[PDB]
Amino acid sequence: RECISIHVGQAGVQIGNACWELYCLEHGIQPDGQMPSDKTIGGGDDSFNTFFSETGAGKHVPRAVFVDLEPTVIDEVRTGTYRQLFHPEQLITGKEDAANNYARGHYTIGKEIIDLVLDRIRKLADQCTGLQGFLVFHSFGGGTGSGFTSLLMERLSVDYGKKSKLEFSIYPAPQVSTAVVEPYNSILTTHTTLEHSDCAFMVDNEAIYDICRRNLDIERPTYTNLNRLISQIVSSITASLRFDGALNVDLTEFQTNLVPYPRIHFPLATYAPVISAEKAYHEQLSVAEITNACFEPANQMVKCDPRHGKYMACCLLYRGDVVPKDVNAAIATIKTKRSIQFVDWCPTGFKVGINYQPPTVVPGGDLAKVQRAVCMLSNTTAIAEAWARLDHKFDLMYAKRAFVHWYVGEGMEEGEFSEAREDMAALEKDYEEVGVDSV
């Protein structure tokens, strides 16, 4: 029961760098891949083996692939503290990036390297007794993150069919955006990928940026700060696959309980508690307190107001000092609050899980080591607010065909821009249809 992570572009690679660093600390894997606590050498059916393969020498190798169309970012990995952890074939780099151009990442530069990426992925898959699916980390805005990811997703649908594909996407934010055409790249990748991904977790950089300032007193956050925080959400989601437990979810479970309709598969994550060490000092937070924090809009990962929408499904993943009795009471209270509205076609609307391994913080980080934490994955109609903001920015530029020549110069037709935008128009409509009360 195994998962392969694919990290694409600067954002995906740099996010993976934080996630795999956290995985090693959670499992006690050293930067050279050795895990002393593991006594089954060269193999095993342990829970952590879903994400780590093993060699006869006792090394624990991530079941991951790093791909970028320029080597600047992945070279850090090849020389960083965790360079020994990855086999050289796992890290794949071109020589010329996509220049914030979806078309270059999909057609011009992407096709140069797609076949090699699939071959290295296939070698990882052949090392599997049973493969659940793929975890794809990328950014909506970059040329490689959008253009190449869409090509990879389409190719994966062919080589592996209906096998699960889950995305971790980075929604553009002007605070740190390095491209004016990011709206074009996001609408195009979303449309191209929309029918290939079974579930996509979006993260709005602006939301993370505000959370880091407010909750962690970080006066001017950097990608390092943001990426560690994303890692906690990714760690919590994968915790049920990497750690052995009786109250876990797996890819198939929480997919089946979060996605009511194929196109409506964009939940927004919420994590709690996000606290600095100063405030954590002499302050321990209860299961109910962190459970209530998940429904406060301030702690969301996409700028939106769930109060102005309706919940269709909530997945609450607790980890740490959490007892079933506390969890049941917390969710019981939520079901009494009327500020939290569920659609009328979802009476049972809570998937629940508990893992007993406590959260881990990387040394030198800003998050405090807490005893219990919770991640909530909620599919609410409020997420459509995010699509509306990005579609409006798409419209403003496309009305004047601004920047479109860069895409036509790389082979695309104006039809793909309207075709993609009409798909987003339908999706915006689908999100209001599902929010209407039944007859």
Binding site: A246, E253, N257, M312, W345, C346, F350, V439
Partner: protein, 418 residues
């Protein structure tokens, strides 16, 4: 001599089944290694009903363990009595069912079902006179829910003249942990209505309130709830495992409990003087299913008392409750309450009372499920997960109709007069 075959499917079924074998192994004096170290000899007169006897006078449960994921399978073998089970009777997959009834019934469970029947067949051929099957499972998941009812359908095709019992955990009115449980439960109930002779309805919310309110367990766990179920499962099988004449085999029990074939869903109960025991077992607060017996009428009832007690006092106290609450017993099935007594008490208790009731109030549970199910199906919410495994929408419509029919039937007899 009249042997029963036990099957446990899914994470829920296996956990409950494992503690069932812990309780009755202790009651029959079997230790984890499979050797008898007991005091009385009534422990062995009917041991062959649930245990095979193997070389060396070691007793091995006639149990088959099933699940589409290996996790809970490994916990069973590491448990207290995990050593006792026949290792060839562990039949497990690797994928899991993902709370998908279609996966357990049609795709992922289909690939594993024949491997299960091969163990079933091998056990049944080793029976002097096979009696029937009993299954433990939940209706909210995908393995015990979906694959469980597949095994039931397959087993009937090979053993159509044998009794089929089930211990089924039903969805609860207010506590749930899976979003699609209305779909999985409604699809299983459709199966059980057609392919089971007796079904015991258990819901966890009732068990949890007992654990929290009555036994005063401040932080109950599935561990604490399962101890209640295993105690009850021991009580309902006492007449099958110890010498007696009343409801001494599965068919005789079914013939005394099931006046109409589709209305075979029972409300179990357990308790905890003789007058005190009899009052408790009838109380709503001692029922394991979330249905008030005072919201319906009892078609039939079976009470089992265990331990040393004055049968005169018991017989007199059972009659008072019947004559005290005549309104809650159908007038057109005379003498529909049957009482049995066994001298062997459970461990920790000296006197126990187990209650089995076929009450029309059970329709409330089937209405709760139907209401939830329709709310989802009218909008086809979460349906793509099922049609994606090959199902058609009309399989859902039929399952809904059958349960709505089952609810109508229960009401029909709740208002019948003489």
């Amino acid at each position: 001599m009249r042997e029963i075959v036990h099957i446990q499917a899914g994470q829920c079924g296996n956990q409950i089944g494992a503690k069932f074998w812990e309780v009755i192994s202790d009651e029959h004096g079997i230790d984890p290694t499979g050797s008898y170290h007991g005091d009385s000899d009534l422990q062995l007169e009917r041991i062959n009903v649930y245990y095979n006897e193997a070389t060396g006078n070691k007793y091995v449960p006639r149990a088959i363990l099933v699940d589409l994921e290996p996790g809970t399978m490994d916990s069973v073998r590491s448990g207290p009595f995990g050593q006792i089970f026949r290792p060839d009777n562990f039949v497990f997959g690797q994928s899991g069912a993902g709370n998908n009834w279609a996966k357990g019934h049609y795709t992922e469970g289909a690939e594993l079902v024949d491997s299960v029947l091969d163990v079933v067949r091998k056990e049944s051929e080793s029976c002097d006179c096979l009696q029937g099957f009993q299954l433990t499972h939940s209706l909210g998941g995908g393995t015990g829910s979906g694959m469980g009812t597949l095994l039931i359908s397959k087993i009937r095709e090979e053993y159509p003249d044998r009794i089929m019992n089930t211990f089924s955990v039903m969805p609860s009115p207010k506590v749930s942990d899976t979003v699609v449980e209305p779909y999985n439960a409604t699809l299983s109930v459709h199966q059980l209505v057609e392919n089971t002779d007796e079904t015991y309805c258990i819901d966890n919310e009732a068990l949890y309130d007992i654990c929290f309110r009555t036994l005063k367990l401040t932080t109950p766990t599935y561990g604490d709830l399962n101890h209640l179920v295993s105690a009850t499962m021991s009580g309902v099988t006492t007449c099958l495992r110890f010498p007696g004449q009343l409801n001494a085999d599965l068919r005789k029990l079914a013939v005394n409990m099931v006046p109409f074939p589709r209305l075979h869903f029972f409300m179990p109960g357990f308790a905890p003087t003789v007058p005190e025991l009899t009052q408790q077992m009838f109380d709503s607060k001692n029922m394991m299913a979330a249905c008030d017996p005072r919201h319906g009428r009892y078609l039939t009832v079976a009470a089992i008392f265990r331990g040393r007690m004055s049968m005169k006092e018991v017989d007199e106290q059972m009659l008072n409750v019947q004559n005290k609450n005549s309104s809650y017993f159908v007038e057109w099935i005379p003498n529909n309450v049957k009482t049995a007594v066994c001298d062997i008490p459970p461990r920790g208790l000296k006197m126990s009372a187990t209650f089995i009731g076929n009450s029309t109030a059970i329709q409330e549970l089937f209405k709760r499920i139907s209401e939830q199910f329709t709310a989802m199906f009218r909008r086809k919410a979460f349906l793509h997960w099922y049609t994606g495994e090959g199902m058609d929408e009309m399989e859902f419509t039929e399952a809904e109709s059958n349960m709505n029919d089952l609810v109508s039937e229960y009401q029909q007899y709740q208002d019948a007069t003489a």
